[PDB]
């Protein structure tokens, strides 16, 4: 595949819609047991923070060169303000709906001796009032973007996916979906869906061989008005499923330092590439390289233009 | 003992010096295991908050009728602001030194199914610059109060106890000490110290009988220039140790709903009573009633005038 000009990518606008969350980590050391309970006492020494969820996908799109918008719901609190800060410095254009009764989604980790002890989640269901308000935003935001990326983490911000998809398709805009859950009936209409071997395992069912691979997946592309599926197989690489054939893209880089964030990087690349007017086949390759590279770096890591 | 007029108590000023901390609780429910670690996932549904440490002792003094000042160190953060809020609405006069490099002391509990899972502490050692600044405050605050209460929780805010005590004694002010630790050499000069049966057990050593009780404790009152010791024995009640005799004060109320906060209530009462010009023997009794009553209520609970 031929490289893509820096001016082309700079024109690429991606509308990322889904669930944003703040990844927070508490590194401390335990030396004693609580006087009131048979539980350890973590004396926190350090906190690390990073954008997670749909925010991470939008972050990857920017570094590659393209522009990125982020439609999502955030609470009226400190974590909400932190996401706003992190977004502004990451170059992502925020389009946030505020729900004071909603806690900003947080996945907090508590660690000691380089291992986890407990995970703490702050999250709730966004009100119908807020969901429709954001849907109104989507109508205004849709014509301003080249391609739409649905980032689902099942936190509630993607209740109206079916309608959002149908709108973007009606405008000739492609719809990409990073899924979550065993039920994908909500995702009908999508241009492309991007599951793992495991994400697809517990929905299409357990299977046999690579010829039977097409046998089930092509049926799934029929069950739901879904044009293509990109199956990320780690070791084996990944395979696109068009209606006019297939494509394989195995491993590329040679570092398995950290897997986290690889999936988010993949779908973010395809979106940004498509927005710049790049063929789907070529876009899949660029997502594979981006994937391969970020594995040689810690969690939320990003491939920029020069690395491609 | 004869009751004490509401006007008398209203005149009583108590200077509480020590470690303040925010007691925070996270009530949630766990339903799954973290995908990245063999640890539970707590989805928090509720947070409860209350003043802890020296702040709680100062809170008890106010409700009884007396005035209360609180000299302590607090960080420049959200928890710090919360303590300031809680203090203002609790009627306690704040005298706070701010250390931006110091986290406001927090003891966070994480609960599920009505039981603890983990305890999380945020705390650090106050700088020498901050400690001396607060000591300068103490010099200004000492002449404005009737009696001084040292509330130690070994968080660092009581590094200069020995000097503070010597100053208050030199002004004819009584010094009360709620201790913490096996080493009490810092507490020399004190008018009164208030340990548990357990708090004294691991410092005076294990012992035999009630006559041997005086044998060791009277030696301790000699080792350190300490006039009196108030030994809280729960079931057996409590016993004051003057140089001119002893006194016993057994159980009074008939509810053991919750023990937490009972000790803080005891020493806070003696201080406030002494400040109003009440004999030490009488002050000990009023602390026993206050103790007995608060046991019939949840943790940080307070006896006001009418209950005495
Ligand atoms: O399991 C998950 O939760 C995410 O699953 C993913 C995410 C991203 C990708 S990108 C991909 C194809 N490209 C590629 N290139 N170099 C290295 C790897 C790789 C990874 Cl990434 C993990 C383990 C082993 C390898 Cl060899 N993969 N497969 C996935 C699967
Ligand atoms: O163990 C601790 O950490 C604190 O230790 C304390 C704190 C406060 C007091 S006040 C006291 C004498 N008065 C009194 N009156 N009614 C009930 C009780 C009581 C308590 Cl409070 C707990 C358990 C059993 C009883 Cl019968 N006690 N002994 C202590 C000891
Ligand atoms: K990574
Ligand atoms: K209590």
TrEMBL record, chains A, B:
<keyword id="KW-0808">Transferase</keyword>
<dbReference type="GO" id="GO:0033785">
    <property type="term" value="F:heptose 7-phosphate kinase activity"/>
</dbReference>
<keyword id="KW-0418">Kinase</keyword>
<dbReference type="GO" id="GO:0005829">
    <property type="term" value="C:cytosol"/>
</dbReference>
<protein>
    <submittedName>
        <fullName>D-beta-D-heptose 7-phosphate kinase</fullName>
    </submittedName>
</protein>
<dbReference type="GO" id="GO:0033786">
    <property type="term" value="F:heptose-1-phosphate adenylyltransferase activity"/>
</dbReference>
<dbReference type="InterPro" id="IPR029056">
    <property type="entry name" value="Ribokinase-like"/>
</dbReference>
<dbReference type="GO" id="GO:0016773">
    <property type="term" value="F:phosphotransferase activity, alcohol group as acceptor"/>
</dbReference>
<feature type="domain" description="Carbohydrate kinase PfkB">
    <location>
        <begin position="13"/>
        <end position="302"/>
    </location>
</feature>
<dbReference type="Pfam" id="PF00294">
    <property type="entry name" value="PfkB"/>
</dbReference>
<dbReference type="InterPro" id="IPR011611">
    <property type="entry name" value="PfkB_dom"/>
</dbReference>
<dbReference type="InterPro" id="IPR011913">
    <property type="entry name" value="RfaE_dom_I"/>
</dbReference>
């Amino acid at each position: 595949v031929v490289p893509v000009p820096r001016e082309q990518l700079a024109r690429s606008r991606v509308l990322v819609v889904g669930d944003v969350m703040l990844d927070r980590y508490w590194f401390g050391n335990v030396d004693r047991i609580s006087p009131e309970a048979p539980v350890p006492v973590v004396h926190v020494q350090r906190q690390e923070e990073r954008l997670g969820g749909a925010a991470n996908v939008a972050r990857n799109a920017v570094t590659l060169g393209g522009q990125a918008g982020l439609l999502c719901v955030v609470g009226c609190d400190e974590p909400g303000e932190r996401i706003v800060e992190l977004l502004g410095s990451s170059g992502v254009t925020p389009h946030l709906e505020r729900d004071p009764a909603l806690p900003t989604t947080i996945k907090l980790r508590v660690l000691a001796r380089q291992q986890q002890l407990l995970r703490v989640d702050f999250e709730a269901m966004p009100t119908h009032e807020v969901l429709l308000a954001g849907l109104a935003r989507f109508d205004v935001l849709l014509p301003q973007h080249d391609v739409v990326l649905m980032s689902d983490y099942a936190k509630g911000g993607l209740t109206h996916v079916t309608t959002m998809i149908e709108k973007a398709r009606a405008a000739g805009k492609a719809v990409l979906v990073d899924p979550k859950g065993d039920d994908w009936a909500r995702y009908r209409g999508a241009s492309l869906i991007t599951p793992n071997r495991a994400e697809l395992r517990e929905v299409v069912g357990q299977w046999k061989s690579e010829d039977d691979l097409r046998a089930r997946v092509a049926n799934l592309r029929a069950e739901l008005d879904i044009d293509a599926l990109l199956l990320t197989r780690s070791e084996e690489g990944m395979t696109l499923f068009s209606a006019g054939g297939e494509l394989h893209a195995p491993a590329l880089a040679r570092e398995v330092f950290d897997v986290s964030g690889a999936g988010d990087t993949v779908i973010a690349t395809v979106a940004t590439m498509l927005g710049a007017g790049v063929p789907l086949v070529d876009a899949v390759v660029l997502a594979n390289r981006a994937a391969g590279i970020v594995v040689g770096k810690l969690g939320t890591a990003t491939v920029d233009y020069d690395e491609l």
